[PDB]
């Protein structure tokens, strides 16, 4: 059997006809070479256009583009009949839609730029799908979904019977849309009368009297989650609630949100934190395809199965492989019995800012291991790191080591006039040419597609990746990475976990990683360091302990339990009040393996 459509997307924001000669496309294009119209010139808006009706998909134009403003993919005809929406000529297109279920939480996972948020505005009524045509009505939509269980949802959606509530992705815009303090907005938006329950569970008591613009990311995020739970509806759609929330906060909100399913409401959530997704979700959808080009929603899957196939990069039913390599967690019985040596040691430390005090318990750092640091923000994790980096003088104690350090800072504000390739090549040009470094670092994080860009012109997520890659291309005795997962989609977090683990493993080096993402911590860690106390007041970093003893100490502070997926080896979360959640807690066993 066979069947195949060609799909061309050109990121115009990257095209510049005057720099590549005269539309390098039509020139290099074989079809145009033999009097054909694969690539046509829009001599007005001055852009090139690929008439997919021609394009053999040979991909010559793609390789040639001096930047990379062209993508040509060969897909099977069949999806053409499940096309849901396309943003225009050579623009991004989405296939299929996720299913919403009364009384449950349907999770959604996949890399950004594959229509996760596109699916949300559509099911919420904000965007009427154009069926990859010129459609502008709901009736044509209802017809297209005849036979699907969504056909009815949409009939109702058009009638005005149901109207979903939405926690928007971009919370950093809320301030510049509303005015006043937090108490006011939450009063108005309230419709179920629970100003107290909500504001309390989300620990908003303080912020209440402050103003929108005086809020941080975490706070802003939380105020959004809040206004959403205060709404009296039936459909709730949360887009990326994990953002800006620390290890503790993000896990506590899933529990708050998931309870909506209990009240018999239909919940939908997009997530990049697998542990948060697992705990939340009853059903799950994977979205695969190339970012910015096209996206396809898989059939609904059981949280467990769905999440494992995800790690493998192969969706059995759909029968697709969206990632060359898999990502498997090492069982436990697979681990290696090793007596490591001490690399360096640190005495009791104390940093006192006057308004906030941190105390560090004495500890040993071993050569070749990886210690993950976890704890709520405002507790002293970064302060700690800066003392080992030496960029911070202790109030008491003293870290005088004779070692080289590679430090990937938490808040990086790119200020370097140059390109990514310039910056990296100046660190270690040879490694950039290494088949090992290109395979484990450079390609996985996508620093090749970034070489040409200027460091100052990079986005939060890109800058994160380049910093991480910069840090890891250096030769040091110890590596310090302060919160790598920030601004990274699900796929990027995984690539970085595998990278950090592989590179440290290969060159036999030691590293310390602060993280709020449970799966990354579990993946890269050999040991753990937990912080407790009163955020913003005092914090105490415990001594390095085993993973089990560690996760046990931290998790009890949140009230969540984890098992071990027999197959994947990944940490599997227990839903609030499950038989296992009960047994495990009764024995104070929050983490297995
Ligand atoms: N209004 C728009 N016009 C054109 N392209 C858009 C628009 N909104 C989103 N896109 C493109 O669609 C792709 C997927 O969009 P989005 O739903 O935001 O993705 P995800 O939620 O997976 O990050 C991105 O490449 C994005 O640039
Ligand atoms: N120079 C300073 N003066 C006063 N307070 C500070 C200073 N630097 C940090 N803090 C406060 O210390 C607390 C913890 O800081 P930090 O170690 O950065 O936390 P985290 O665990 O989020 O990394 C925060 O409440 C922060 O406002
Ligand atoms: S797509 Fe690439 S090669 Fe073609 S005009 Fe644009 S910049 Fe030039
Ligand atoms: S992929 Fe090949 S055939 Fe299609 S537009 Fe580019 S060069 Fe022409
Ligand atoms: Mg045209």
Q: Beta-carbon neighbour count of residue 11 at 10 Å? A: 17
Q: Please give the residue range of the domain that contains residue 421.
A: 331-593
Distance 13 CA to ligand 1 centre (A): 14
**What is the CA 119 to chain-centroid distance, rounded?**
17
Check: CB of residue 5 under 8 Å from CB of residue 52.
yes
| CA triple 163-164-168, angle to 5 deg | 135
In terms of Cα–Cα distance, which of 95, 93, 4, 89 is closest to 50? 89
Q: Which of 330, 351, 385 is the last residue of a domain?
A: 330
How buried is residue 469: exposed, middle or buried, by Cβ count under 10 Å (0-12/13-18/19+)? buried
Separation CA 327–CA 568 (nearest Å)? 9
Cα 565 from Cα 335, distance rounded (Å): 16
13 exposure class (CB count in 10 Å sphere: 0-12, 13-18, 19+): exposed
| Whether 404 and 472 share a structural domain | yes
Supply φ then ψ for residue 481, to 5 degrees.
-120, 110
Q: Which residue has the tokens 């195949």?
A: 4
d(Cα 554, Cα 62) in Å, to the nearest integer? Answer: 49
Contacting residues for 582 by C-beta, under 8 A, at least 6 apart? none
Q: Which two tokens stand for residue 283?
A: 């059903």
From the CB of 10, is ligand 4 less than 6 Å away?
Answer: no
Task: Tell me the C-alpha distance between 165 and 235, whole Å.
Answer: 6
For residues 256 and 188, state if they share a domain: yes
Nearest atom in ligand 1 to 270's CA = 21
Strand partners, 269: 107, 238
- Ligand 2: residue of 381, 383, 386, 411 to mutate (most ligand atoms within 8 A of CB) is 383
Q: Determine the straight-line distance between the first and last CA of the chain, rounded to whole angstroms.
A: 46
**How many CA atoms, within 13 angstroms, populate the side-chain half-sphere of residue 45?**
8
The response to whether 559 counts as a known ligand-binding position is no
- The neighbour count for residue 359, using CB atoms within 10 Å, is 18
Q: Are residues 343 and 275 in the same domain?
A: no
Distance 280 CA to ligand 2 centre (A): 31
- β 5-9/39-42 pair status: unpaired
Which of 302, 271, 165 shows the shortest CA–CA distance to 225? 165
Q: How large is the greatest C-alpha to C-alpha distance in the chain, in angstroms?
A: 78
For ligand 1, whether the C-beta of 71 sits within 6 Å is no
Q: Is the CB of 29 under 6 A from ligand 4?
A: yes
Q: Which long-range contacts (CB under 8 A, 24 or more apart) does 128-136 make?
A: 129/84, 129/85, 130/85, 130/86, 131/83, 131/84, 131/85, 132/83, 132/84, 132/85, 132/86, 132/93
| Separation of alpha carbons 304 and 148, rounded Å | 25
**Resolution limit, Å:** 2.8
- Show the tokens assigned to 537: 């007041």
**361/539 Cα distance (integer angstroms):** 11
Radius of gyration from C-alpha coordinates of the chain = 25
Query: Over 404-417, what HEC string results?
Result: CEEEECCCCCCCCC
φ, ψ dihedrals at 387, nearest 5°: -80, -35
Query: Residues 273, 404: one domain?
Result: no
Same domain? For 313 and 357 the reply is no
Q: Is 73 in the pocket of ligand 4 (CB under 6 A)?
A: no
Count of residues in the chain: 593
Q: Which residue, 315, 330, 345, sits at the end of a domain?
A: 330
Tell whether 342 is in a known binding site: no
d(CA 356, CA 240): 31
Nearest alpha carbon, ligand 2 atom 5: 353
- b/e 73-105 (16+ beta carbons within 10 angstroms → b): bebeeebeeebbbbeeebebbbbbbbbbbeebb
Q: Which two tokens stand for residue 109?
A: 């996972």
Residues with a beta carbon under 5 angstroms from ion ligand 5: 49
Place of tokens 């995800």: 310
Co-location of 312 and 400 in the same domain: no
Instruction: For residue 195, give the CATH number of its domain.
Output: 3.40.50.300
Contact 585, 557 (CB under 8 A): no
CA distance 482 to 121: 34
102 and 180 assigned to the same domain: yes
Nearest alpha-carbon partner for 61 in 35, 98, 23: 23
Q: Which residues contact 243 (CB under 8 A, 6 or more apart)?
A: 169, 171, 217, 221
Residue 411 Cβ contacting ligand 2 at under 6 Å: no
Our measurement of the distance from residue 127's CA atom to the centroid of its chain's CA atoms, rounded to an integer in Å, reads: 24
Atom of ligand 3 nearest to the CA of 23: 5
Q: Give the ligand whose atoms come closest to the C-alpha of residue 10.
A: 3
For residue 32, count other CB atoms closer than 10 A to its CB.
19
Query: Considering every ligand atom, which ligand is closest to the CA of 40?
Result: 5
Task: List Cα–Cα distances, 462 to 245, 458, 468, 470, in angstroms.
Answer: 20, 6, 10, 12
CA of 486, nearest ligand number: 2
Instruction: For residue 200, count CB atoms less than 10 angstroms from its CB and return exposed for 0-12, middle for 13-18, buried for 19 or more.
Output: exposed
Q: Atom 25 of ligand 2 has which residue's CA nearest to it?
A: 536
Counting the structural domains of the chain, the total is 2
DSSP type of residue 442: I
The number of the ligand 1 atom at minimal distance from the alpha carbon of 88 is: 4
- Picking from 14, 9, 25, the residue whose alpha carbon sits closest to that of residue 68 is 14
Q: Where are the strands (E) in 367-416, listed by range? A: 370-374, 405-408
Residue 322: left (phi > 0), alpha (psi -120 to 50), or beta?
alpha
Residue 284 and residue 413 share a domain: no
Expressed in angstroms and rounded, the spacing between residue 40 Cα and the centre of ligand 3 is 12
Q: How many CA atoms lie within 13 A of 235 on its CB side?
A: 18
CA angle 352, 407, 514 (to 5 degrees): 65
The pair of three-digit structure tokens given for residue 461, joined into one six-digit string: 């997520």
Q: Which residue has the tokens 């040691």?
A: 345
Under DSSP, the state recorded for 340 is P
**DSSP H or E stretch at residue 307:** helix 303-312
Measured from the Cα of 32, ligand 4's closest atom is 8
Give, using CA atoms, the residue closest to atom 17 of ligand 2: 380
- HSE at residue 248, side-chain half, CA atoms within 13 A, is 21
SS3 of 21-54: CCCHHHHHCHHHHCCCCCEEEECCCCEEEECCCC
Measure the CA–CA gap between 526 and 147, rounded to whole angstroms: 51
Task: State the distance from the centre of ligand 5 to the C-alpha of 49, rounded, in angstroms.
Answer: 6
DSSP state of 453: S
Q: What's the rounded Cα separation, in Å, for the pair 395 and 293?
A: 53
| Residues 264 and 291 placed together within one structural domain of the fold | yes
**Which residue has 């990274």 as its token pair?**
488
130 pocket-lining for ligand 1 (C-beta < 6 Å): no
DSSP secondary structure string for all residues of 247-301: HHHHHHHHHHHHHHHHTT-EEEEE-S-HHHHHHH-SEEEEEES-TTTEEEE---E
Q: Which of 330, 353, 378 is the last residue of a domain?
A: 330
DSSP state of 109: E
Residue 123, CA distances (Å) to 28, 155, 156, 269, 323 in order: 42, 12, 11, 13, 28
Rounded Cα gap, residues 294 and 292, in angstroms: 6
| 252 pocket-lining for ligand 2 (C-beta < 6 Å) | no
Separation between Cα atoms, residue 564 and residue 166, nearest integer Å: 33
For residue 175, what are the contacts with CB-CB under 8 A and spacing of at least 6? 212, 213, 215, 220
Pairing of strands 527-534, 545-546: antiparallel
Residue 389, phi-psi category: left (phi > 0), alpha (psi -120 to 50), beta (remainder):
alpha
For residue 83, report the distance from its CA to the centre of ligand 4, in Å. 23
With a 6 Å cutoff on the Cβ, whether 116 touches ligand 1 is: yes
Q: What gap in Å lies between CA 230 and CA 186, rounded to an integer?
A: 7
Spatial CA neighbour of 505 closest among 536, 483, 472, 481 = 472
d(CA 240, CA 269): 7
Q: What is the DSSP letter of 100?
A: P
> What separation in Å is there between the alpha carbon of 380 and the centre of ligand 2?
6
Q: Is 354 left (phi over 0), alpha (psi -120 to 50) or beta?
A: left
| CB-CB contact of 52 with 58 (8 Å) | no
- Whole-number Å distance, alpha carbon 40 to ligand 5 midpoint, is 7
Same domain, 454 and 553: yes
Give, for ligand 4, the residue of 6, 7, 38, 74 to mutate: max count of ligand atoms closer than 8 Å to Cβ: 38
Q: What are phi and psi of 394, to 5 degrees?
A: -70, 155
The verdict on 257 and 352 lying in the same domain is no
16 lines ligand 3 (CB under 6 A): yes
Sequence-distant (6+) residues with CB within 8 A of 350 are 357, 358, 359, 360, 394, 395, 396, 397
Which ligand neighbours the alpha carbon of 360 most closely?
A: 2
Distance (angstroms) between ligand 2 centre and the Cα of 536 equals 7
- Among residues 488, 519, 516, 504, the alpha carbon closest in space to that of 310 is found at 519
Method for this entry: X-ray
Nearest residue to 273 (alpha-carbon basis) of 294, 257, 254: 254
Whether residues 299 and 431 share a domain: the answer is no
Strand, helix or coil at 502? Answer: helix
């Amino acid at each position: 059997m066979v069947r195949k459509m060609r799909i061309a997307v050109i990121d115009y924001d990257k095209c510049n006809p005057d720099k590549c000669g005269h539309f390098l496309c039509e020139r290099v294009c074989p079809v145009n070479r033999m009097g054909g119209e694969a690539i046509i010139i829009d001599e007005e808006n001055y852009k090139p256009i690929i008439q997919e009706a021609s394009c053999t998909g040979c991909g010559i134009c793609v390789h040639k583009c001096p930047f990379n403003a062209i993508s040509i993919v060969n897909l099977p005809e069949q999806l053409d009949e499940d096309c849901v929406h396309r943003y225009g000529v050579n623009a991004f297109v989405l296939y299929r839609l996720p299913i919403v279920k009364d009384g449950m939480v349907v999770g959604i996972v996949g890399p950004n730029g594959t229509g996760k948020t596109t699916a949300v505005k559509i099911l919420a009524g904000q965007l009427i799908p154009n069926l990859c045509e010129d459609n502008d009505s709901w009736d044509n939509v209802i017809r297209a979904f005849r036979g699907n269980e969504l056909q009815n949802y949409f009939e109702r959606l058009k009638n005005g019977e149901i109207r979903p509530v939405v926690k928007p992705q971009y919370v950093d815009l809320l301030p510049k849309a509303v005015k006043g303090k937090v108490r006011e907005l939450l009063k108005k938006v309230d419709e179920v009368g629970k100003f107290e329950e909500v504001v309390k569970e989300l620990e908003l008591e303080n912020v209440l009297d402050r103003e929108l613009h005086q809020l941080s990311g975490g706070e802003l995020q939380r105020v959004a989650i809040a206004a959403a739970l205060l709404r009296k509806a039936h459909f709730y759609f949360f887009d990326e609630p994990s953002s800006y929330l620390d290890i503790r906060q993000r896990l506590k909100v899933a529990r708050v949100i998931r309870r909506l399913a209990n009240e018999g409401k239909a919940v939908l959530v997009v997530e990049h934190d697998l542990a948060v997704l697992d705990y939340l979700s009853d059903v799950i959808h994977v979205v695969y395809g190339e970012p910015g080009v096209y996206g396809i929603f898989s059939k609904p899957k059981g949280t467990r199965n769905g999440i494992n196939e995800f790690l493998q990069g192969y969706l059995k039913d759909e029968n697709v492989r969206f990632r060359p390599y898999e990502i498997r967690f090492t069982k436990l019985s697979e681990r290696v019995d090793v007596e490591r040596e001490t690399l360096v040691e640190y005495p009791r430390l104390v940093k006192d800012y006057g308004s906030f005090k941190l105390e560090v318990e004495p500890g040993e750092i071993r050569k070749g291991e990886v210690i993950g640091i976890v704890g709520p923000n405002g507790i002293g994790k970064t302060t700690f790191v800066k003392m080992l980096a030496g960029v911070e003088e202790p109030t008491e104690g003293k870290v005088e080591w004779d070692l080289t350090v590679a430090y990937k800072p938490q808040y990086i504000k790119a200020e370097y006039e140059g390109t990514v390739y310039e910056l990296l090549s100046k660190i270690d040009s040879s490694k950039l040419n290494s088949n090992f470094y290109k395979t484990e670092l450079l390609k996985p994080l996508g620093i090749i597609d970034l070489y040409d860009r200027n460091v100052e012109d990079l986005s939060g997520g890109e800058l994160q990746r380049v910093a991480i890659a910069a840090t890891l291309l250096r030769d040091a005795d110890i590596y310090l990475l302060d919160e790598p997962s920030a601004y990274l989609d699900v796929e990027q977090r995984l690539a970085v976990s595998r990278a950090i683990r592989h590179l440290m493993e290969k060159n036999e080096k030691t590293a310390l990683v602060v993280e709020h993402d449970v799966l990354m911590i579990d993946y890269v860690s050999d040991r753990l360091i937990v912080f407790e106390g009163e955020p913003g007041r005092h914090g105490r970093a415990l001594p390095p302990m085993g993973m089990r003893e560690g996760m046990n100490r931290f998790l009890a502070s949140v009230g969540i339990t984890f098992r071990r997926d027999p197959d994947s080896g990944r940490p599997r979360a227990n839903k609030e009040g499950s038989v296992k959640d009960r047994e495990q807690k009764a024995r104070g066993e929050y983490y297995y393996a």
